[PDB]
Design a protein around this ligand. Structure first.
Ligand SMILES: NC(=O)c1ccc[n+]([C@@H]2O[C@H](COP(=O)([O-])OP(=O)(O)OC[C@H]3O[C@@H](n4cnc5c(N)ncnc54)[C@H](O)[C@@H]3O)[C@@H](O)[C@H]2O)c1
Ligand SMILES: NC(=O)c1ccc[n+]([C@@H]2O[C@H](COP(=O)([O-])OP(=O)(O)OC[C@H]3O[C@@H](n4cnc5c(N)ncnc54)[C@H](O)[C@@H]3O)[C@@H](O)[C@H]2O)c1
Lengths: 384, 384
């Protein structure tokens, strides 16, 4: 088979990078009991940079020894990119959400050999799922592989916004002190009302991390969580995002992107919050209305916004989220921490081993299978 | 009586600042059961900026209606400052750790009428406690008033360092994407060994917030914390900082500054840490050896350092912690969040009410009284 794999470019300083440490923690299970990936072998040391062109997700020896061809590129934009030129006869396509090879309906039609669209990471919305369903393509991802990474990044951003960390660090760097300027917009998180959109794998991980900050917790969901979870954490449930928006000082988004969540957080919802609220989005950018977020920050309706997700990806140099007021953005990096990469690279290999050996891909990894939403896709996504 | 009060300058934009929100959460009690301050009245709305010259800690009407004189200044450096000029006949001196009016033995000797040195906030190491003891000066601070603020700031900084937030935000602001550059030094906190120096009010708050991140928790103290605490958090105790350094990926300092803790974190301790470890210090700068920290970052012995405390304060524009590699510094701001300010300003007034009415200052607020370490000072500090 031909495996076509799109990864981001190597570090500016070169590959490999100079690693700050020589090992990372050993993770065996996710909080819900799911085991970390179980490929037969891995051809990397956990902690290595795997998600860039030279890193290759550690897959080359494995694929070529079986007689498959493995094409790796970062060049993914337009009909003249390496990606689109190599697409028509690729059996399998792999890319990461951080540098996504979009499989639009038009591209799927051109992909005459495509049978498996494999996300390296979590979130397969860069694939047109309706088109994949119609084309009979399997869509899968490494569920939970980098979910805790996102949960940490989200809680970090909540804190940085509320406490006014980023402008205060700039003052330290620039030679200032200026305590009054630092703290004129600095609040404690303690006692605020904080809500998550969804309490899935990441949403629940965030709620658990927020609990000892002594905030009052809220959430919305497609499907309400068990009573035991609500009792454990002291959750207040809301039937809609609008309802939650009315009562929360901070909201963090943790739902997947699909038609029913597209532009969920637009002006109508933003305006339901109390002036000077905070919004963190480490889910997907288009869950928010891009320009309404800017407008909310310019008016102070939002006191701050932060996230690592953008649309499109990569974000153009002039994307308005870069320099809008009171933002805490990063490029899309959370799930690509070196710790996270170890797990999703291992899961990518695990899935390929199953696929090539005619064994099932884990149900929890499935998004689309045999012409319908399947596995986690059937539980978490919609196509309406 | 004459009250001499040193506060930091007003915001550059003017006073009052434009507030992001009009109200803050109501806190009634601290986690150990201690009640928040109980002055008879407050002359401010919680949420207002109080720690600057125009804010006056909300004290002017209270003091002036009682016939006391109230001098507020930010000018605190040298014998020609408003502070040192007004000092000789001041009965009471108040300042905040964030912009501290240092009471050196020399200044205390000039202060012929000084009977009460009152810290607005937590931590009174800017007062020479030996000289205060000699002169029969009462030293007090508002215990717990901004402890949660510091704990939040410390956990925020831990995440920012480990995850490589700050350089990644700069990339987003500058128009880049560069995922490999962002994540070449980005790790999850999950599964790391994290230790605190002390498990006092702030240290315990930090340990509780760290717990749901699924880290392995350690601490060092002169004596063990209660079994209930160790069991709750799954704590591993170490007799010395050196011992804890050997096993932790991340350490956060939460002990007071006095002779036994001065330069505790010097090369000897730092070199016990594994190469690529992280250190956070929101306690006092001089618990670390300033230049040993710089060199540890330059060599990669530490992968990162962050804190909001410096020496001296304010830090000179050329202070080496500002631009040393891989830092997450802010000016000294954590305890002066608007949320914290409401509490310590209320407590400052409570202490003044007791003092003027000839009633005891709360034992937990006392550091020095009746010529010796007293209250919290006797339990937490030393005088070598
Ligand atoms: N750094 C990254 O790129 C990265 C990594 C992981 C996840 N993510 C994003 O976060 C999303 C969630 O991740 P997860 O691991 O928790 O997946 P998950 O499937 O376990 O949880 C998603 C939850 O969202 C709920 N949901 C669906 N529609 C909703 C709606 N309209 N309103 C409220 N809730 C709704 C689902 O029921 C589900 O419980 C991913 O789809 C992905 O987009 C990004
Ligand atoms: N960044 C900020 O804004 C800020 C604000 C306030 C206070 N602080 C600092 O944090 C310090 C602690 O605050 P707290 O409220 O938790 O006070 P605390 O008195 O409750 O806790 C101090 C703890 O340190 C322990 N300790 C004393 N000597 C020690 C030693 N030699 N080694 C290890 N542990 C030792 C004490 O026993 C005690 O448990 C303050 O003294 C202050 O310096 C920082």
């Amino acid at each position: 088979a031909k495996v076509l794999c799109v990864l981001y470019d190597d570090p500016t300083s070169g590959y490999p990078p100079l690693y700050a440490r020589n090992a990372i923690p050993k993770i065996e299970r996710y909080p819900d009991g799911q085991t970390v990936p179980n490929p037969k072998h891995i051809d990397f040391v956990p902690g290595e940079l795997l998600g860039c062109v030279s890193g290759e997700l550690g897959l080359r020896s494995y694929l070529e020894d079986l007689g498959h061809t493995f094409i790796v590129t970062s060049d993914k934009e337009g009909p003249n990119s390496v990606f689109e030129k190599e697409l028509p006869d690729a059996d399998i396509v792999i890319s990461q959400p951080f540098w996504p090879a979009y499989l639009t309906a038009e591209r799927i039609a051109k992909a005459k050999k495509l049978k498996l669209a494999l996300t390296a990471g979590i979130g397969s919305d860069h694939v047109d799922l309706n088109a994949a369903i119609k084309a009979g393509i399997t869509v899968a991802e490494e569920t939970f592989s980098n979910g805790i990474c996102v949960a940490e990044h989200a809680v970090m951003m909540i804190l940085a916004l509320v406490r006014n960390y980023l402008p205060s660090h700039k003052i330290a760097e620039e030679g200032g002190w200026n305590i009054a300027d630092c703290v004129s917009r600095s609040y404690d998180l303690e006692g605020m009302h904080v809500g998550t959109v969804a309490a899935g794998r990441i949403g629940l991980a965030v709620l658990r991390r927020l609990k000892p900050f002594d905030v009052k917790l809220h959430y919305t969901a497609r499907h309400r969580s068990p009573r035991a979870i609500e009792d454990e954490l002291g959750l207040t449930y809301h039937a809609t995002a609008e309802e939650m928006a009315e009562v929360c000082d901070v909201i963090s988004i943790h739902a997947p992107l699909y038609p029913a969540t597209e532009h969920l957080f637009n002006a109508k919802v933003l305006n339901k919050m109390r002036h000077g609220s905070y919004l963190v989005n480490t889910a997907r950018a288009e869950i928010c209305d891009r320009d309404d977020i800017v407008r909310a920050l310019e008016s102070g309706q939002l006191a701050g916004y932060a996230g690592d997700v953008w649309f499109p990806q990569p974000a153009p140099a002039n994307h308005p989220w870069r320099n809008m007021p009171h933002n805490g953005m990063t490029p899309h990096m959370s799930g690509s921490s070196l710790s996270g990469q170890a797990r999703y690279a291992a899961g990518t290999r695990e899935i390929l081993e199953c696929w090539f050996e005619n064994r099932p891909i884990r149900d929890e990894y499935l998004i689309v299978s045999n012409g319908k939403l399947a596995g986690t896709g059937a539980k978490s996504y919609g196509v309406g």
